[PDB]
Amino acid sequence: ILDGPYQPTTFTPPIDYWILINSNTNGVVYESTNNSDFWTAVVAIEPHVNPVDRQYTVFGENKQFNVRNDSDKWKFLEMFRSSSQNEFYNRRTLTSDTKLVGILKYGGRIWTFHGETPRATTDSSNTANLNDISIIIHSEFYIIPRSQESKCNEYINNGL
Amino acid sequence: ILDGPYQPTTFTPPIDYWILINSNTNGVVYESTNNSDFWTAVVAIEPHVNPVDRQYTVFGENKQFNVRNDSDKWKFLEMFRSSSQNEFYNRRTLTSDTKLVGILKYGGRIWTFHGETPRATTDSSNTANLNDISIIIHSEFYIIPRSQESKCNEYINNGL
Amino acid sequence: ILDGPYQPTTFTPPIDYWILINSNTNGVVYESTNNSDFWTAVVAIEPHVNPVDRQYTVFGENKQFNVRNDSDKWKFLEMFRSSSQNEFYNRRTLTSDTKLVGILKYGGRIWTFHGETPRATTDSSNTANLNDISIIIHSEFYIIPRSQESKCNEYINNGL
Amino acid sequence: ILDGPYQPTTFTPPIDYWILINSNTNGVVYESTNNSDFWTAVVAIEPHVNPVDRQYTVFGENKQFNVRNDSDKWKFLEMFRSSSQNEFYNRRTLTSDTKLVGILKYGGRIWTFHGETPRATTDSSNTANLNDISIIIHSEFYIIPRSQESKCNEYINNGL
Amino acid sequence: ILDGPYQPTTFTPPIDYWILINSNTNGVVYESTNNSDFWTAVVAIEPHVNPVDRQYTVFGENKQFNVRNDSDKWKFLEMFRSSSQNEFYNRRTLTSDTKLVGILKYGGRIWTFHGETPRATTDSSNTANLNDISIIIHSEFYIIPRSQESKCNEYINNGL
Amino acid sequence: ILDGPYQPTTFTPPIDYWILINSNTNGVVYESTNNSDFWTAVVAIEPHVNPVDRQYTVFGENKQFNVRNDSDKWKFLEMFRSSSQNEFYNRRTLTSDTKLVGILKYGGRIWTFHGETPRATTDSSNTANLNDISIIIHSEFYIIPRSQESKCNEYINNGL
């Protein structure tokens, strides 16, 4: 039933499908932008990390993020900005022991999971141009139709 | 010295300028949004108004707000929401007998005046997208550079 | 309660308001684009015009459109293309004796009136970026909240 | 000579190339849309299928399609809609024992093969936006330049 | 034929149109920016001005520009910077006794006239974001389609 | 550190990343266009080739190119056109014994390497539509962030 795994790649995800990414390291998980008003990059932080500056490559630039993780689970930090000129800030956080992150393009919005597993839930983000939001995925990933979102939710919160 | 008056219009205010609006009736003074995470509409309440439900058109919708004003001065109510899905609430108030209200896009934030004249002071509102914030203004207004904010403060509090 | 008339101008109309334009000549009534995937120009054809090529200036270019109108009423032709390299084609037509044309930005789509008065109805067009769609209006116009679309519909179909 | 085979993927086909897809099962062969006025999904129906309603996942939704094949060959049904608010109808059919389907973006239109091998011919579908048409392909496929369309035609009708 | 004159205002000029501004004093003629990679202010220097620092308000701030005019004509100095953290420099100059200045958004660039009337010519400036370039105009101005640029050239060099 | 190698494919490269292509034969190295104002195809010419017409498939069509290499190194010729209805001309050349070529989308322009290794340098080409520039790559390639352009310069000129 499950479509994947797909190799890391760059493409424009179709409307109405969940992209489910299997993180495998403490780097950038994915970067997403439409190059007009929406830039999101998600960074993985391994458990038990005392506050520290780390350097990440996002959208072709070297950026320094102050980062922390007191949990025994992994933290996936959504870093967002709406213009190349603003600094990134941590918009949302997903705390997970399954290392799965999800993103959906639907109904003019970007949907992702946040909170802590196994009770993580979806939240939405606005944009002036949803269709052109493209993504660079640095891990294996799966494609799941929105029709089977309950299945995507189960994965995010319990594993594959 | 003063840049204006300009006629009612809809535009995207330049960064680093005070928009100073001279209110002339008891309706919607202005409406501002980036259609992503920031909506504000300012409604003018004339002096000595017992609690009452009034209909206003804001962002193309007919909204009812319960409103009051126990003072001898006009009250300008900031009605705010951070999502197209939320109801509004009265976030801030300017109590004024100069009938001047001000709004500024600067440093990643929206700045307005609250309090009571002649001691009204600025306060900030955060947004993730300052640049795309536009405004509909329903009365005459002036444009003042932030370099002359001291002057804008004098006008807000003491009038022209 | 009718907001206007406003002078011909160039702006980006706010979401959730009908722009009602009172055509006054047989030229270009308005031109609307987001400069990425949506260009629409409406041209006004007076009653009883045998098939003929006419020159119009649209989006800064001199364009030739083959044009007709056998009706006793005016015809407002929606000329559309999705890229600066496509040719325009007549996408919709409003046949009116009120000479009022309407355009609305709502729900990710552009809404306009088409058909024949007094039975003209609204239709939608898709685009990847609704928010950035601007318009140049070459005649006086009015602004009407979508909340009052029933009256916009009545003006379109019966006049001011 | 022949460009491919490429693995199943999601991308935006370059203008002026035939995408030639080798179908291997009785499900969705590919999904194509520009998310404005064009959605086409092709479903593969195995030989000798009595009229039956089958579930397919298309554009992220579960859709039920009435399907039929009394032939000894496979049937590839193009299911079409020009708006996300319309029901799909079976617009065209390719009856084939080569199991090759083809799609081309060229001259402002989508071209595909239909009819019955070895006498299948090309047919066009109009759209307002050719360039933003992208595709999800669920099987191995080849890329052939339109300059070699005669060879694409041989493959469709005779196999590789 | 000529569209205008229009009153001083702030707006986002349409792509493919010359904005022709009739300067009437020795101040800032216009300010234009997309707030990302393009800031330009044009200042008007009356004839016979010895080299001197003059204070101008541009983009909401007080700046002093090294200014001079050893000629009998007016000089219009383009002051430019590519980031908010750079200081302005005089990138270009138009020497004119018509007092008309021109700016055009086209082909991913900003075009303006420079040199000396009656032989002023156009030149371009790169930007990565042409669509968001807005302008504050401090004088009456006209709008001329790029299709009639030869007339705009004549106006620039010879007057209206 | 180095991201790749990736297999030949068609995609829209992200903004602000060098695409570094390792040429492996004397055919078309890559084809890139936005289908509006930018078409570029690079052809690889093996050492010691007398001036001659060779025919290549670019953008789905057969084209004849005047081709020459009088050196011991490979020559990579940039064939360019700015319109569908124009013919290609040789815009730039990279002479190289590393057989690496580079293309970057940045700052509203397309950047490539030209000259002769080990002293090849970058040059830019204007476009009005950088975001729609897609590419077909015919060899293995790598992706390097612009923040590491000095390493990309090192690979271009000295190899991996």
Can you write the helix and strand succession of chain A as a string? EEEEEEEEEEEEEEH
Q: Class of chain A, according to the CATH hierarchy?
A: Mainly Beta
Number of domains of chain A: 1
**How many strands appear in the DSSP assignment of chain A?**
14
What portion of the residues of chain A fall into strands of 2 or more residues? over 45%
In oligomeric terms, what are we looking at? homohexamer
* CATH architectural designation of chain A: Sandwich
Largest beta-sheet details of chain A: 12 strands, mixed
**Can you give the helix content of chain A as a percent range?**
under 10%
Query: How many separate helices of chain A?
Result: 1
Gap between N and C termini of chain A, in Å? 12 Å
Shape of chain A: globular
PDB class: viral protein
Keywords: rotavirus, VP8, vaccine, viral protein
Assembly: hexameric
Entry title: Binding specificity of P[8] VP8* proteins of rotavirus vaccine strains with histo-blood group antigens
Describe, in plain words, how this protein is organized in 3D.
The structure is a homohexamer of 160-residue chains. Chain A is mostly beta strands and 160 residues long. Chain A has a single domain (2-160), classed as Jelly Rolls. Chain A is 6% helix and 57% strand. Chain A contains 1 helix and 14 strands, in the order E-E-E-E-E-E-E-E-E-E-E-E-E-E-H. Chain A has one helix spanning 149-158; strands at residues 3-6, 9-11, 17-22, 28-33, 39-45, 49-58, 61-69, 74-81, 89-96, 100-106, 109-116, 121-126, 134-137, 141-145. In chain A, the strands form 2 sheets. In chain A, strands 1, 2, 3, 4, 5, 8, 9, 10, 11, 12, 13 and 14 form a 12-stranded mixed β-sheet that branches. The first copy, chain A, has a two-stranded antiparallel sheet with strand order 6-7. The first copy, chain A, starts with a strand and ends with a helix. Chains B and E meet through loops of B and strand 2 of E. It is classed as viral protein. The entry lists the keywords rotavirus, VP8, vaccine, viral protein. It forms a hexameric assembly.
